[PDB]
Structure 1
Amino acid sequence: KLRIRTPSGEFLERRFLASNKLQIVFDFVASKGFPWDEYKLLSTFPRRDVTQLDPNKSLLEVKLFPQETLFLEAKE
């Protein structure tokens, strides 16, 4: 369960199994108008940019907690 925030601050919710590649999450954000190219997926506490993490790695391996709030910012 990941809660992703649009740059306008609207929550987007979806559940993925930990076995799911990070790409699955990328596709989910790619569903809305948030391409990997144009938008970054940020984590806070800890502070990291999931965008640049390897898509093939499992959600467990990308060290995403069972619950994580994430944020979207334009890669400008």
Structure 2
Amino acid sequence: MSENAEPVSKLRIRTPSGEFLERRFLASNKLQIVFDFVASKGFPWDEYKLLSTFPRRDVTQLDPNKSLLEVKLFPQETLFLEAK
């Protein structure tokens, strides 16, 4: 849940193949960590685009030096991989 502990974001990311990556992050940390994570799964940010509904935006387009809190990825959010 939530307290005066560290904020943490749970992310569900759906690969094109339809599988889901699921992974929890420090919400105060850089978005890059997410980019690193998908990349490490085979979906480098140059090959694929990382999409969010909510409003539908392409997360890979954001500044990886921003926190998840800043880019509005907290506390749970599903993202969608999509080749370019």
Distance 2:78 2:13 in 1: 6
Deviations 1:14-58 (A, max 9, x none): 000111100000000011110111000000121100010000000
Q: Decide which structure has greater strand share.
A: 2
Deviation of the 1:64 alpha carbon: 1.1
- The residue aligned with 1:58 is 67
Q: What are the ranges of 5 or more consecutive residues in structure 1 without an aligned counterpart?
A: none
Percent identical residues? 100
Q: What are the ranges of 5 or more consecutive residues in structure 2 without an aligned counterpart?
A: 1-9
SS at match of 1:26: helix
SS at match of 2:60: helix
Distance 2:74 2:18 in 1: 21
Deviation of the 1:59 alpha carbon: 0.2
Distance 2:54 2:12 in 1: 14
**How large is the RMSD of aligned CA atoms in angstroms?**
0.7
Distance 1:21 1:40 in 2: 18
Distance 2:30 2:20 in 1: 22
Distance 1:5 1:49 in 2: 14
